[PDB]
Amino acid sequence: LQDGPEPTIHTQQAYAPEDDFTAKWTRADARQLQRMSDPTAPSRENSMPASVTMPTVPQDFPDMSNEQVWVWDTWPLTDEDANQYSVNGWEIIFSLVADRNLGFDDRHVFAKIGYFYRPAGVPAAERPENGGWTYGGLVFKEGVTGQIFEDQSFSHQTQWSGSARVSKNGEIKLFFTDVAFYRNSDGTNIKPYDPRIALSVGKVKANKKGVTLTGFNKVTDLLQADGTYYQTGAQNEFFNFRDPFTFEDPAHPGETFMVFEGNSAMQRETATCNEADLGYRQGDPYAETVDDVNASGATYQIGNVGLAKAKNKQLTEWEFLPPILSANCVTDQTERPQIYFKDGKSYLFTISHRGTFAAGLDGPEGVYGFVGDGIRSDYQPLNGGSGLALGNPTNLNFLGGQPFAPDFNQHPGHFQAYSHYVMPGGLVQSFIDTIGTHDDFVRGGTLAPTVKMDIGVGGDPTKTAVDYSYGSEGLGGWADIPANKHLFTNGKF
User: Is 161 exposed, middle or buried (0-12, 13-18, 19+ CB in 10 A)?
Assistant: First the structure.
């Protein structure tokens, strides 16, 4: 540790889901990331501790769809405990996909949800190098996902990330972000975009032939930003609102909860941070003033993790609860939040970019983690209060560059992995954005090798460590999304 501020003291104390306690990931906490970085790290070398850095992905990577489509954010078939399922001998995944003819950076506004399947239980090394997935095509027929929007003049209409529950009778509830865009030919908004948390129900049919899906013809509009707990388009043209992950909390049986990315509901240009947001211990030599922070531009970075509760058993009606985590003046984006249960603890994992960090702060691309005694709690950021669980190899002493333009001095795996997702046994799956140096890089659009992150080193639930023995030198199978539970169903085709 370099000298710096102390981390904010977090109690981990549980609260009721309905309470409006909102844990803060503080500037104090986030500044621990800089303290863990090694100032002397030379050009293109990782400066972050190996134990919180994803193993380096080879630039010579296979493609999981044989280049049929761009693939990114991926999620398995789950139950209320986040166990991952095969059906009738097939592991099944949902992924954001886009036409491979698109420029990689243009794909976001043409995203759709597709699905892949592969035989379950094939010896991990008897499996093809690329994962052995079969692309099943698109989940939705043309025109289905548009049905929820009153305003049909949209220029673009996407399906963004979420989660998918499978029932014992083979029903699939697909929770996703249904998004409408209103853009001129140059990308400028005619009005703010319209992302909604949505549900679509279907069925899995699976044979020795493979897997097909039926249904997914009706979409229920579940949630949209309210303006009290979660920032709206009116409040912020480029507000975040997406990524439903649903689950059952062991401490609140028979009820269903959802976490999702949001922003703190403040007016963009008059937003302010307070002393809680900064979070310094009295008389820390490294303390900032509220005025200094408020004047820096840090107030433009006000991401949050939301929580909602299902009103019925069908999960077609939801009630907003107050945010469970705020990163005011810390980051714009806490993406793809998920709650992970282990050893009596609630782990909130979330994904962030380097570039979204507020002025005065810095951190790698990757997984940020938080632990508490309840789904609403005074969350403790993992690893010395920093919040870092699994960062891409990063030289934090040098600029980050961009995935379309890596920085001259940056580690070539700075953008090697994004939209990570923590599976049972701490196995982490993610997709490749960019690998390579400033003058020799490639884009991914395919999944990275799965890696292992051991959660709770010693008896300490606040620490994690990458397991570098897993697979080859830390890298497991390409696109490996293993099922730990298995279902057999009526459905066939």
Answer: buried
